[PDB]
């Protein structure tokens, strides 16, 4: 158990073809013997080191799906990271991606709820920061609508939350460092847009920036 995990760690660090083959066979045979924690750790280690046979990953996908309900937050994060940095030829069956997608969204929603309750200004602070340098059309967006039902939704009329959006954003650095000028900000935005375009040629970030 502990020795086998250390052996996998050492072999992965060495990054030798024969060692990877030996580790792949050993883990594949001992998947049932190893517990959920060991399976998650080895899956994470393989992903970060970028090695593993397609059959091994396919069987790991089956194991993760079967044992998914008994996973903690740390276990879920490690599996997400490992399956994120997985070999390219690892087209997964349409059960694990759904589980990872659902789990990741739930973690974000729960984190948002916990942060908002602890500090009601958490959501407001983020939105102001995002909208500080945003374009005018971005600020023109409508407001949130009340989805609650009842008399106001069935027999009454509920006034909308939209109000005038002519506001001035004053940005001040908490640390006190000098802020970037308009030219510097434009260069920063342009550089990021170019990087995103290279990763995704179909991105329309150029048009979005050009709009305003």
């Amino acid at each position: 158990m502990s020795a086998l995990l250390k052996e996998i760690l050492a072999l992965t660090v060495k990054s030798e073809a024969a060692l990877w083959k030996g580790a792949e066979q050993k883990v594949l045979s001992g998947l049932n013997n190893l517990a959920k924690t060991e399976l998650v750790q080895i899956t994470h280690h393989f992903g970060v080191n970028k090695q593993g046979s397609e059959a091994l990953w396919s069987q790991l996908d089956k194991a993760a799906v079967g044992a998914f309900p008994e996973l903690s937050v740390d276990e879920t994060l490690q599996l997400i990271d490992g399956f994120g940095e997985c070999p390219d030829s690892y087209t997964l069956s349409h059960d694990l991606n759904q589980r990872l997608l659902v789990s990741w969204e739930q973690l974000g929603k729960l984190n948002f709820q916990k942060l908002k309750e602890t500090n009601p200004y958490f959501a407001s602070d983020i939105v102001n920061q995002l909208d500080a340098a945003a374009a005018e059309f971005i600020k023109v967006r409508p407001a949130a609508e009340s989805e609650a039902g009842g008399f106001l939704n069935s027999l009454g009329v509920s006034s909308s939350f939209n109000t005038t959006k002519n506001d001035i954003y004053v940005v001040q650095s908490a640390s006190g460092k000098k802020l970037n000028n308009k030219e510097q900000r434009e260069a920063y935005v342009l550089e990021k847009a170019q990087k995103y375009l290279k990763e995704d040629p179909q991105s329309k970030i150029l048009d979005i920036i050009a709009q305003k």
Binding site: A144, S146, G150, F151, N153, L155, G156, V157, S159
Partner: protein, 127 residues
């Protein structure tokens, strides 16, 4: 364009802008108790509910039933989910209560004369 105006009139009278409750209130306001269909036939409402100068017993029973039902619904709703935007009217009431609680604190620890002078100065600046 006559069709366009007619469609606009229908939309302006839509439920989302003119509540059906307003129409029901308007119908009750315009019609008498003998012409109102909702109550002319029903003798209980026309006599036992709205016909008694003092109906404390029935009023109390109705309020108790309504209170328990709404307490149950609110408890169920809070238990199930809470990350749902609430209506503006309910939000404003909660805002006013929180402001009122703070205002009581200020009044408790501050003099009436100081309050009056501060408010007068603030009003003068606003003008």
């Amino acid at each position: 364009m006559f069709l366009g105006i007619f469609k606009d009139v229908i939309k302006l009278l839509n439920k989302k802008v003119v509540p059906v409750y307003f129409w029901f209130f308007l119908y009750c306001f315009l019609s008498t108790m003998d012409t109102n269909i909702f109550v002319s036939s029903c003798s209980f409402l026309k006599v036992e509910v709205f016909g008694k100068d003092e109906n404390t017993t029935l009023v109390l029973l109705f309020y108790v039933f309504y209170s328990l039902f709404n307490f149950y619904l609110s408890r169920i709703k809070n238990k199930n989910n809470y990350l749902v935007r609430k209506h503006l009217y309910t939000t404003e009431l909660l805002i006013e209560l929180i402001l009122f609680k703070y205002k009581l604190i200020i009044l408790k620890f501050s003099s009436i004369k100081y309050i009056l002078n501060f408010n007068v100065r603030k009003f003068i600046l606003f003008n």
